[PDB]
Automatic annotation (TrEMBL):
GO terms for molecular function: RNA binding. The keyword ATP-binding applies. ATP binds at residue 81. This is CRISPR system Cms protein Csm4. GO terms for biological process: defense response to virus. Residues 207-297 form the Csm4 C-terminal domain. It comes from Staphylococcus epidermidis (strain ATCC 35984 / DSM 28319 / BCRC 17069 / CCUG 31568 / BM 3577 / RP62A). The lineage of its organism: Bacteria, Bacillati, Bacillota, Bacilli, Bacillales. It comes from the Bacteria. Keywords: Antiviral defense, ATP-binding, Nucleotide-binding, RNA-binding. Belongs to the CRISPR-associated Csm4 family.
Length: 297
RNA sequence: ACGAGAACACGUAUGCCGAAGUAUAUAAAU
């Protein structure tokens, strides 16, 4: 169980609905998708890295401090205002939060100190139209990009057998030169990675409790969802989009809509996910990653 | 098998226009 540190140094576009939307972190779906496409391009085998590996979502970090998503636990006060405005809780204070030891003023201070990047829109045009030869409008369009301070970035949580971890490290060595976002070929999204161990993160990841904090985007398989939702606090997130090299027409190929729990849901009955298939009318199967990575407290 | 994929904030035009470095007061007294 290692973590992988990511520093960017170039703006990255991550996207929700259009190109001119900017987003800070990315989900396990696009992460596994990038790993899988990099593997296929490299020509190695996918069986090893399909049904053994567990990937957690990407989360941001700052100078020396790491972050995790806000648990969706019922804190019984009544402000319900400063906490709603909080999105990430530093690791130093995680167990303090889950025991209701976080004060309103401390929450305000954390919100004040949480600057880890800013948003930008760069305007771009496209003269590929008749403009080159005849009177034709240049078509302006915008892309949403997000940048980090020189001491920031994203990090991973990965776990599995050591052989799978070695394969993952190889693939990431390959991948640091492809992208991890949107307009990869337009100049966005190259990174350097580094493997680090953290004593505090390790203790947090190997705790023992009664609840569970979901750190990835997963969906229970058909026969286990019924028992999964006995006592659950969760939010669903729709995940759609097109696919890369499935048929002749990109604009005719579009993945089937899929729904999965978010990255902060709390469950009482642990379930195992699966790599659901979201293909139809296609030559090769298309995958989406739904497999949980729990922390028990 | 990444709400992805194609996509030059791009093309036409200037520091110009008018204005004098002037206007006064002897190289002298013993």
């Amino acid at each position: 169980t290692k973590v992988f540190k990511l520093s960017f140094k170039t703006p990255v576009h991550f996207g929700k609905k259009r190109l001119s939307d900017g987003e800070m972190t990315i989900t396990a779906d696009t992460l596994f998708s990038a790993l899988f496409i990099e593997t296929l391009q490299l020509g190695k085998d996918t069986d090893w890295l399909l049904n053994d590996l567990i990937i957690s979502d990407t989360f941001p970090y700052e100078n020396e401090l790491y972050y995790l998503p806000k648990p969706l636990i019922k804190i019984d006060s009544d402000n319900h205002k400063a906490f709603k405005k909080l999105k990430y809780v530093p690791v130093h204070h995680y167990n303090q939060y889950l025991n209701g030891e976080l004060s309103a003023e401390d929450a305000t201070d954390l919100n004040d100190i949480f600057n880890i990047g800013y948003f930008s829109l760069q305007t771009k045009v496209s003269l590929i139209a008749q403009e080159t030869d005849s009177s034709a409008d240049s078509e302006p369009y915008s892309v949403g990009t997000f940048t980090f301070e020189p001491e920031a970035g994203l990090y991973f949580i990965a776990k599995g057998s050591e052989e799978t971890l070695d394969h993952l490290n190889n693939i990431m060595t390959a991948l640091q030169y492809s992208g991890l976002g949107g307009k990869r070929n337009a100049g966005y999204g190259q990174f350097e990675y580094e493997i680090i161990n953290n004593q505090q993160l390790s203790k947090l990841l190997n705790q023992n409790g009664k609840h569970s904090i979901l750190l990835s985007t997963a969906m229970a398989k058909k026969e286990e969802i019924e028992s999964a939702l006995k006592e659950a606090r969760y939010i669903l997130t729709k995940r759609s989009g097109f696919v890369q090299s499935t048929n002749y027409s990109e604009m005719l190929v579009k993945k089937s809509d899929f729904y999965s729990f978010s990255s902060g849901s709390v469950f009482k009955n642990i379930f195992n996910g699966d790599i659901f298939n979201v293909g139809h009318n296609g030559k090769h199967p298309v995958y989406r990653y739904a497999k949980p990575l729990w922390l028990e407290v």
